[PDB]
Amino acid sequence: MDKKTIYFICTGNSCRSQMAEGWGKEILGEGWNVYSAGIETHGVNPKAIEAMKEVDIDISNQTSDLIDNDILKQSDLVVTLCSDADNNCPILPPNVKKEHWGFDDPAGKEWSEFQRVRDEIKLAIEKFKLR
């Protein structure tokens, strides 16, 4: 079996989707190619980078990307991580499955909020692996 493809989407491919990609590559790596994108590109959020450093994962060289239809077409699961991404997700290929895993936006808050959301994302990906 070829590896499956999971595509994490948030508003700016900045924070939630970047943490999801960082965790995903570690947790899902044996079975999955992991990509992330956004409605816009805001760059990788500095507090998200710091949050991932605390769990020994470097996301500082991950890319902030717009949604790519070729990746959409080849996705086994598209995961929207916020309301903007979910409400503005482009029309998907008819055979491509999408789920919304909503997480709070730590935007503009203390580092603790990034730690909180980081770890909610970690658990969601761990559960997903074992579905």
Ligand code: NA
């Ligand atoms: Na990306």
